[PDB]
Design a protein around this nucleic acid. Structure first.
Ligand SMILES: [Mg+2]
Ligand SMILES: [Mg+2]
Ligand SMILES: [Mg+2]
Ligand SMILES: [Mg+2]
Ligand SMILES: [Mg+2]
Ligand SMILES: [Mg+2]
Length: 170
RNA sequence: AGCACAGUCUUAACGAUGGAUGUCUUGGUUCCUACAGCGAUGAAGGCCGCAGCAAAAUGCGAUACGCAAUGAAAAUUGCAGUGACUGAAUCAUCAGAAUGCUGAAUGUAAACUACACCAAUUCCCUGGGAAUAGUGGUACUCCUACAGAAA
């Protein structure tokens, strides 16, 4: 895991190996999540899967629409990536389970590190035009998540100068 | 419990992606030396097989990842099983035995497992007693010899 931690007794990790979801959507979701209390994040994810609150697409925002929900995050564009959220939800659940297994109270857990990397793409073919084969690759991703429990030198001359200054001020 | 606008750009740290670099190396390459042909006694090439659980390659040929014999010589192992306390398990050696269907392919054929014709053939026992439609043979050219016919 990419973080600096010090005390892993207070942390709960969780990963997804090679998730068959789009990196960009899931990245966006992760961004939306990060620095949330775990339960709140979970709630948010559930809302997005039932299309009630959007995830705002701020970085990878080419063509993404113009939802009414994005006002909540001071933004115009947003989406409700379902599959991505589901995958993320699963990994959140895993994290929660891990925390439980340890002695971490899930109320006090913050997502300190939600990392999404892109994984090696699965290759397929698409057929175009005048007998031209093109790639039709997935962009799967690795997800790492870390929840975490939360609550000179003087000198004589210099000294003299200082004293003088003080006197002057007085 | 709070606080960071977001995006773009940059730097550093820590990761992903990728397979560079370095290190290897049962491979190649070159040169040198040595021998040097296989085949109607069916070659090379090709098919089809063959393992207890077996695809490829490797090896082998209805005795089919091997038989005999020789020289090692106690194991072989994924499991099953087979062996030792030396013709036995495994290696090498390989001279004996065997070597499917083809292929020059050669009885006529050939996108045929098509078809002829001549021998019936084969084994066992010391002259009989058993098998099996199975096994051989038959190309063209040529040579020597023989044959009885032709001018
Ligand atoms: Mg900003
Ligand atoms: Mg010669
Ligand atoms: Mg032997
Ligand atoms: Mg021996
Ligand atoms: Mg023939
Ligand atoms: Mg025909």
């Amino acid at each position: 895991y990419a973080k600096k931690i010090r005390n892993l007794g207070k942390c709960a990790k969780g990963a997804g190996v090679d998730l068959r979801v789009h990196f960009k959507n899931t990245y966006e979701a992760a961004r939306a999540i990060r620095r949330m209390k775990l339960l709140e994040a979970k709630k948010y994810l559930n809302d997005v899967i039932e299309k009630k609150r959007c995830v705002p697409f701020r970085k990878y925002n080419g063509g993404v629409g113009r939802t009414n929900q994005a006002k909540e995050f001071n933004h115009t564009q947003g989406r409700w990536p379902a599959k991505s959220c589901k995958f993320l939800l699963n990994i959140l659940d895993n994290v929660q389970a891990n925390a439980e297994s340890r002695n971490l109270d899930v109320s006090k857990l913050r997502l300190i590190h939600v990392m999404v990397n892109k994984a090696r793409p699965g290759r397929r073919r698409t057929y175009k035009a005048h007998g031209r084969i093109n790639p039709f690759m997935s962009s799967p991703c690795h997800i790492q998540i870390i929840a975490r429990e939360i609550n000179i030198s003087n000198q004589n001359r210099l000294k003299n100068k200082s004293v003088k200054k003080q006197q002057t001020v007085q």
